[PDB]
C-alpha cells in the first residue's frame, strides 16, 4: 500500500532522486529472513508516514541494481537520505531492533 515495488529501471527515479528517507530492502523469495521481515516493512511503513518510504527490489526479479551497492548477503536494508546511503542493515531483525535502526539512522 505505501510501499513501493522497485526496479532496475524505476531505481534511479524512486530511489536516489526522491527528497527524502527511503529504506531500501534488497530480498528474493527463497530467502526465509526476507519473508520473516516483510511484514514488519509493512508496519514500518505504516508507522513511519512522513518520515520514510519504505521501498523493495527484488534482487532475482531485478539483478541490476544490488552489485551497485556492493550487496552480498539478503536481506540487506539500505536507508537513504536523499540518494545516499546512511545506514547499512544485514539480515533479518526484529521490529523492536529496525525501529532503533531507523530512529537513530533518521536523525
Same mark, same amino acid.
Given at each position: 500500500?505505501?510501499?513501493?515495488?522497485?526496479?532496475?529501471?524505476?531505481?534511479?527515479?524512486?530511489?536516489?532522486?526522491?527528497?527524502?528517507?527511503?529504506?531500501?530492502? #534488497?530480498?528474493?523469495?527463497?530467502?526465509?529472513?526476507?519473508?520473516?521481515?516483510?511484514?514488519?516493512?509493512?508496519?514500518?511503513?505504516?508507522?513511519?508516514?512522513?518520515?520514510?518510504?519504505?521501498?523493495?527490489?527484488?534482487?532475482?526479479?531485478?539483478?541490476?541494481?544490488?552489485?551497485?551497492?556492493?550487496?552480498?548477503?539478503?536481506?540487506?536494508?539500505?536507508? #537513504?537520505?536523499?540518494?545516499?546511503?546512511?545506514?547499512?542493515?544485514?539480515?533479518?531483525?526484529?521490529?523492536?531492533?529496525?525501529?532503533? #535502526?531507523?530512529?537513530?539512522?533518521?536523525?
Amino acid at each position: 500500500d505505501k510501499i513501493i515495488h522497485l526496479t532496475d529501471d524505476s531505481f534511479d527515479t524512486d530511489v536516489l532522486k526522491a527528497d527524502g528517507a527511503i529504506l531500501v530492502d #534488497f530480498w528474493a523469495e527463497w530467502c526465509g529472513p526476507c519473508k520473516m521481515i516483510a511484514p514488519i516493512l509493512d508496519e514500518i511503513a505504516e508507522e513511519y508516514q512522513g518520515k520514510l518510504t519504505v521501498a523493495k527490489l527484488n534482487i532475482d526479479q531485478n539483478p541490476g541494481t544490488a552489485p551497485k551497492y556492493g550487496i552480498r548477503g539478503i536481506p540487506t536494508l539500505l536507508l #537513504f537520505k536523499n540518494g545516499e546511503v546512511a545506514a547499512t542493515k544485514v539480515g533479518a531483525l526484529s521490529k523492536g531492533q529496525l525501529k532503533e #535502526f531507523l530512529d537513530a539512522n533518521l536523525a
